[PDB]
Amino acid sequence: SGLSYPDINFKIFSQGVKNISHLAQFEKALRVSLYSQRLDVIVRESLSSLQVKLENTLALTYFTTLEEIDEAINIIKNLSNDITQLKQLFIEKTELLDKSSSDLHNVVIIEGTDKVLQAEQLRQKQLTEDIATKELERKEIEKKRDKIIEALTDARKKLDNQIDTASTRLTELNRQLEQSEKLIAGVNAVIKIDQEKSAVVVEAEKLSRAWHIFIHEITALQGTSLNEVELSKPLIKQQIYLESLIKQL
């Protein structure tokens, strides 16, 4: 008594699972989308199944207690059993959602990615350093061919061997530069995947704790079952809260 439901911003969650499922481009980053998808569906239906179950039980709570109004001891049996079954649904859905969340949190990607960045940086500086020198060589023999052509012919056609070798080296290194840049971009993509997946996991923990808070509130009633008017209020409070959460997607 006296607690408040945590602030849940499902925009980051929704757009994060969207990003991750749509960022499966650039090997192992595939699997992080699969588990996050399972979690994604787990929540997606659970909060909806909890909604329709919450409202239904509402339509039943005033039903059973309408049978309590009819006299104006089985109603207590099925009443407490029904509210405890709702609590049990909250139990199992918290267990399932949190199992998915803590299972998703185990798998990670970094600690084996910055290594590749370190290697790629040195190869990249070596590449951009050597391409300039090979281009200098190409330019030297280019002046040598231009000055002689602009006017023996055996030499004019023999220098083309060195021209073609230098050109093949240039194309041989440019594709390597593109490969290194692609690797760098993919590593940065996997880093951002980590970041947004972490936001998703934090949101999952927040929602699990919110469900824990409401189930704590449900347990606060126990089996006294003295008043219905009060019982209706926390149920509809989670109804609004969870419905607003369902709205945010």
Author numbering: 10 to 35, 45 to 90, 109 to 187, 246 to 343
The authors write:
We have unraveled structures of the soluble components and the pore assembly of the YaxAB cytolysin from Y. enterocolitica. The crystal structures show an atypical fold, comprising a head domain reminiscent of ClyA family toxins and pronounced coiled-coil and foot domains unique to the YaxAB system. In line with our finding that the isolated YaxA and YaxB head domains form spoked oligomers in solution, the YaxB head domain in isolation was sufficient for recruitment to membrane-bound YaxA. Together, our biochemical data support a role for YaxA as the initial membrane-interacting subunit of the toxin, able to bring the lytic effector YaxB to the target cell surface. Therefore, we propose that this class of toxins defines a new structural family of α-PFTs.
The orthologue PaxB produced better diffracting crystals than YaxB and thus served as template for molecular replacement phasing (the two proteins share 40% amino acid sequence identity, whereas YaxA shares 18% and 22% sequence identity with PaxB and YaxB, respectively). Our structural data confirmed that YaxB is a true homolog to PaxB, with a RMSD of 2.1 Å across 210 Cα pairs. Notably, the YaxB foot domain could not be resolved in the 2Fo–Fc electron density map and therefore remains unmodeled. Because our monomeric YaxB model was incomplete (with the foot domain not resolved in the electron density map), we superposed both monomeric YaxB and PaxB coordinates with protomeric YaxB. This likewise revealed only small conformational changes in the YaxB head domain (RMSD of 1.3 Å across 178 Cα pairs), accompanied by a slight movement of the coiled-coil stalk away from the incoming YaxA. Using a liposome float assay, we could establish that YaxA binds membranes while YaxB fails to do so.
